[PDB]
Amino acid sequence: QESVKEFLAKAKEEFLKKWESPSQNTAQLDHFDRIKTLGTGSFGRVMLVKHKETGNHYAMKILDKQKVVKLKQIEHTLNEKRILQAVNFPFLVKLEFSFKDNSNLYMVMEYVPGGEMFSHLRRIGRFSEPHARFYAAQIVLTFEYLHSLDLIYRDLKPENLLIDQQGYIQVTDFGFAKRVKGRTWTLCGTPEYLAPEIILSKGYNKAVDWWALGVLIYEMAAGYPPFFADQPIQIYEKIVSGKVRFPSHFSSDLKDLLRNLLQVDLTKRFGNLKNGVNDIKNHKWFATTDWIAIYQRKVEAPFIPKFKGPGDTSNFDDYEEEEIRVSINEKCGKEFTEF
Ligand SMILES: Oc1ccc2[nH]ccc2c1
């Protein structure tokens, strides 16, 4: 489909130019006011900030260099920033600035006030198939884009999908994203979403993203993921088993697509066959999807999140507000030279 071919060729050209000459050091911390903590983790946080001169709001991801090193995430954090500064797609959150200081790494991203898909899904219970399909189509196109650039995303889950002011998806958190020719081996992701070949410590490829899409679509339409249990090891046993149970309310088309995405044999899994993404795009479950209209954001969304303005934090939850401390001495300078 020459139109798609030429689109992806241009996309790769533009990505490669930025990939080979990454931007660095494009703002500093005291250009911003701190507003609110939007999320936390073992080695970083995300803050709502306001730029003091323009008044624009942003989501600032702050990574503690010493904790990144301790938790063996050095290459991953370098991956995240190098990839984010080089990509450009309607459903990827934009990196606006990055910089580092003696203690931390900073990625300043567009602020998406609608919150995580996770919150909306848990609030409503489950999405109707048209609603799930609207979001799934955006992920399909996003993975078509990323995979053409030799990128694997490796962290698809509802918490990483923000809903924007038009009700479209913005993918965030490229902490496990990686440029991979051939195979890669790192154990990473979230247990419920891991493909069998990750669990079994194999060399794996982009097929793991298509498996995760199967998990996401199931969870969106059912309200719960297909492989669920108290301990990860019990989850992993279900994932590798080759068995999935579908709610009776699922359409036959949905069940058929999901059996082909949740295919334990990665050599038979949709997205990893000779026809690539088109086995998914042409599946009957997507028969009502106008792929170009989705890309162009011309489809009316299933819902618009409720929020009062670009500074509204109501769709995110409350965390202890901790200091952003910057040591008087540089930490881990060598490890993060390229950031
Ligand atoms: O706009 C954004 C971007 C990344 C994020 N991570 C957590 C909240 C959040 C908001």
UniProtKB/Swiss-Prot annotation:
Assembly behavior: A number of inactive tetrameric holoenzymes are produced by the combination of homo- or heterodimers of the different regulatory subunits associated with two catalytic subunits. cAMP causes the dissociation of the inactive holoenzyme into a dimer of regulatory subunits bound to four cAMP and two free monomeric catalytic subunits. Activates cAMP-sensitive PKAI and PKAII holoenzymes by interacting with regulatory subunit (R) of PKA, PRKAR1A/PKR1 and PRKAR2A/PKR2, respectively. Interacts with NFKB1, NFKB2 and NFKBIA in platelets; these interactions are disrupted by thrombin and collagen.
Organism of provenance: Cricetulus griseus
Enzyme class per UniProt: transferase
Endpoints of the signal sequence: none
Source organism phylogeny: Eukaryota, Metazoa, Chordata, Craniata, Vertebrata
Start and end residues of each AGC-kinase C-terminal domain: 287-339
Membrane topology type: Lipid-anchor
Positions carrying Phosphoserine: S128, S327
Cell location: Cytoplasm; Cell membrane; Membrane; Nucleus
Chief location category: cytoplasm
Name the record gives this protein: cAMP-dependent protein kinase catalytic subunit alpha
